[PDB]
Write a protein that binds this ligand. Structure first.
Ligand SMILES: CCCCCCCC/C=C\CCCCCCCC(=O)OC[C@H](COP(=O)(O)OCC[N+](C)(C)C)OC(=O)CCCCCCC/C=C\CCCCCCCC
Length: 269
């Protein structure tokens, strides 16, 4: 079991992120869906636990046959590659549990996130146990840093070091945009502390795949947030009410696209 916490500082407020994240997840899902693969939203309902925690529940399935590397592909029968995502989104807090029916208990990708109005300086925000938290590598993802992006993933239109929002005036993010957040009254900020736990108990592959999965998560978080910022003008004025409507349409769209369109998005690698 390999744990790492990815801290993503962003030039948006905690409240704005709640909308930007929902908007961006919708667009990112569609960009990867078609030809039978991609995202399928099964459940999207509001929930309330005994303790009173309220939030939004979603159950999705990521069909991943040809989008996964060959060493992963020739590892299980077709269809066995799909993974399920169940998330209890009680924003600012969220717990996401990803599973695989084939490996059952041997597989787990859990992402627990705390969205704080600070600059990523809170240690052990998920309040684990002292020693355990010591074995948690903390990694910072700088959405402005070109060297943190994979060459094949780069797209100038999704580069915040070149993007300037027309509606807010934020951007482009320079090499020192972070340290700058403290000088300007404008340009709000927050930090997503994403604790990722990966378990892949497979004889002889555990170490390789648990590390491979973290890299893909780091890669996803980097591209996702660079896109979220660059899409700032598309969602900053949306309300939570706009999102809900947009989500019900997205669900339909994902299904439609998945059956017609050919496979699209990030090719295996
Ligand atoms: C024997 C066989 C067993 C093996 C099984 C195969 C395992 C696959 C191996 C590697 C794959 C690792 C990459 C994980 C891909 C799944 C994406 C993922 O883990 O999503 C979760 C992340 C973090 O959770 P969250 O709480 O932040 O948000 C969700 C909660 N909510 C909605 C309330 C905000 O969500 C986010 O960052 C938001 C972005 C979500 C939307 C992106 C759509 C992705 C669709 C396709 C991905 C294509 C890439 C395939 C990788 C191939 C490698 C080359």
């Amino acid at each position: 079991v390999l744990l790492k916490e990815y801290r993503v500082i962003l030039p948006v407020s905690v409240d704005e992120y709640q909308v930007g994240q929902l908007y961006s997840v919708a667009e990112a899902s569609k960009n990867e869906t078609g030809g039978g693969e991609g995202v399928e939203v099964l459940v999207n309902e509001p929930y309330e636990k005994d303790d009173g925690e309220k939030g939004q529940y979603t159950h999705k399935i990521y069909h991943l046959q040809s989008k996964v590397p060959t060493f992963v592909r020739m590892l299980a029968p077709e269809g066995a590659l799909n993974i399920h995502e169940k998330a209890w989104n009680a924003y600012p807090y969220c717990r996401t549990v990803i599973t695989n029916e084939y490996m059952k208990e041997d597989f787990l990708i859990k992402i627990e996130t705390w969205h704080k109005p600070d600059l990523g300086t809170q240690e052990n925000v998920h309040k684990l146990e002292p020693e355990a938290w010591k074995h948690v590598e903390a990694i910072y993802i700088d959405i402005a840093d070109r060297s943190q992006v994979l060459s094949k993933d780069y797209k100038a239109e999704e580069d915040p070091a070149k993007f300037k929002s027309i509606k807010t005036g934020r951007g482009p993010l320079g090499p020192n945009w972070k340290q700058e957040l403290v000088n300007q009254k404008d340009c709000p900020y927050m930090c997503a502390y994403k604790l990722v736990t990966v378990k892949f108990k497979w004889w002889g592959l555990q170490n390789k795949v648990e590390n491979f999965i973290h890299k893909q998560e780091k890669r996803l978080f980097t591209n996702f947030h660079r896109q979220l910022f660059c899409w700032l003008d598309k969602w900053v004025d949306l309300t939570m009410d706009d999102i809900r409507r947009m989500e019900e349409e997205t669900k339909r769209q994902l299904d439609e696209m998945r059956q017609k369109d050919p496979v699209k998005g990030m090719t295996a690698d």
